[model samples]
Target: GLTEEQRMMIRELMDAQMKTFDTTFSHFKNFRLPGVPSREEAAKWSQVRKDLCSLKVSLQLRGEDGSVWNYKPPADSGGKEIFSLLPHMADMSTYMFKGIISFAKVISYFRDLPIEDQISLLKGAAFELCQLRFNTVFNAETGTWECGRLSYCLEDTAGGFQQLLLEPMLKFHYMLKKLQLHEEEYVLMQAISLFSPDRPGVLQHRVVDQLQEQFAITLKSYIECNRPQPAHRFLFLKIMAMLTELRSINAQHTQRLLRIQDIHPFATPLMQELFGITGSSSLTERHKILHRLLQEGS
Candidate 1:
């Protein structure tokens, strides 16, 4: 269990960080915008000792329901057709692209990493993070993601990818939603996935490994302290196991996209860059964008 002081600290950090997303959305709900913490704010959080016990407690506490954002089902509650995959992809990709910035604002620890390290983690884990975040709005019964007024069913994604990828994605969403994860669990899970040490291009393996371990411990502790017996049994194990499945799905999405690369009207430039759809030699655009986004809050 977390100490009272530590718990309060976690709540403060989580609330403020989550608010960054809410505020950004308020600026332009459709694709919204980005926000960053001031230098003083960033400095204060960075000053927090990121040791194992403190970090664990922070995760346990942050896992609590302190998120500032909520999904409001659209008025009609009806599904909409996606006329073209590229345009829709552009919209969705841009939305989540802003989410990457929001992610930076919330996870101060990520900002402390080397610039190359930060990009590596974001590049490796962005899709996984998007999937986990999307689960919050996923309605299993309806088989749709009710994200604000923009609702999309698997069928709407037709012609974009094969059933091979879409079928597994929906199943994965259903599986995660069925788990009925708490807000805290969801946040920590994303943290753990983002800090993964084994990404192909990662240089700070040991540091990332330690951070991942801390997150994993925090998640386990949260489950032990909060979940009922039946649910807690091997829950941590199950959650960690899902990371493998998420990676599998992530890889498939990349392959599917690569297969369809020749089709004109592909994903947006940001999407192509983030997914490494374009050649790896020229990461100038991505690096510049990331630096600009990171500077917003600095």
Candidate 2:
């Protein structure tokens, strides 16, 4: 439903967001690998070279759940006591909030939907999109999210989580990292996931479906243009397969979150609101806050 100019504008906006995201982590540039690779190197590395690297990284990060993979728990500076360091929910929520704001700005069409539908789309997609965004900082080599000053291991931030949920999450991140997705691909993926019409409570299916299709097409075009190898022909399908994996993980995440909250409530307001912890009576209040946020962000 979009004209060529409109689509180009959307791509430009998403591209700008990608640049800004890179700048945010510019100080940590050295933390990531190989700043540049030739097109031949990129292709060759993904197959033979990268698979070997992934195997080595996998061994460094995973074991049979016992304690083999760098089993060092946090300890106090004095060495007097051991401690479990958990990241505050509020701190993580700040990143999630920034991601949502950036997404809103990139996709101006988000402001066109009815307020209820807007909330519905966000409620369904925000967590998945945030997970994709967070993976940008994921260091598969060490199995940690290296966010500049505070690097977080799964055991550190997610102490109470079951391996059933944690294992797949780690696997997904490792697989994604192996792909070595460019910034353009990452942003397009986020946009494609966000416009899903299947999200519960979404009433504007026709509009949302068309929008999702547009992004999907854009991603396909980008992949085709950038990767002209016959070996890379299935790259689009592979990336889409990861979305299915992400959905499975997203479901497990919600179930685990609910179980955790049943034992003890989440302290963060945004967490409570995003994870179905807020009561039905607060729905209007939630929408009010989000509407204002989107308005200001847009």
Candidate 3:
């Protein structure tokens, strides 16, 4: 994929990006409505506002739809926004949408891609990438995706994917959370997913494959450094399993997308394309799968 000098430099540059991503405001998602804001919190609040503007432009909403899904409850008497989180299914997707954007902004390879190419990458991987981050809301103690301080059955919390694939989605996340993967592992997993070499419309398949390989090697090495014993040899293998499992989950979500397109005409154009409306071939392929699912479901 990459030549000698270019390979080493690109490796280091991508390596450095993980640290920057760690500090981004949304990176440390924990439903922190826990602690109230101090003066220190004001800075984070201001950054949040700046980030929100880029988002409105990013999503290109019109009219009242421009309002973000993240709502601010009335601030305390001090005017500090209360500790909180998203309220609706749309709200939760909004945060994950932001996260997918944040994830892409850091990787130079992703940032340097042509705009059309970038959109294609996103359509292929956004659901899979955001689906991984969706687990941050998972409460290890309660086994529920916490909505603010609120907790409920995880299956019902998924608004858009709910009827289509929420149960399988919840079950998948449930098993994943049980592993309690290291943060680096999770980040690497997502980076790998996002750089799909064979993504629909990808012109630089070799370059994308190499990028995915770079992240995969980094993950294997990280596992090696952490696990010294032969007893834990396949920890990397188990982690690789997440990749396969998540791909299956993506397939399920896409299947759901085609099934519901007629029923839910309001899905964003981006969402429609993500599931497989990108072009004539994609539409034909999607309908093939849709017809299969219809026959099976019937």
The candidate maximizing TM-score is: 1
lDDT by residue (1-298, candidate 2, tens digit) is 4458646855765664654353333333222211114796445433432222111211122323544433344333422112121124344554565566556555667777877777777777777887787788887766667654444565423343233234677778878888888877887777777788998778889999998887788777777777767867888888899888988877877766565454344425556656667644444466565656656733
TM-score winner, 2 or 3: 2
Model 3: residues with Cα > 4 Å off, grouped in runs: 1-87, 147-152, 155-167, 276-298
Q: Worst 10-residue stretch by lDDT in candidate 3? A: 53-62
CA lDDT of each candidate?
0.61, 0.61, 0.55
Model 1 weakest 10-residue run by lDDT? 52-61
Per-residue C-alpha lDDT of model 1 across residues 25-104, encoded as one tens digit per residue: 33424442111158964443333221101101000111125543322222222122111233545566567666755675
TM-scores, all models, native as reference: 0.71, 0.70, 0.59
191 Cα displacement, candidate 3 (Å): 0.9
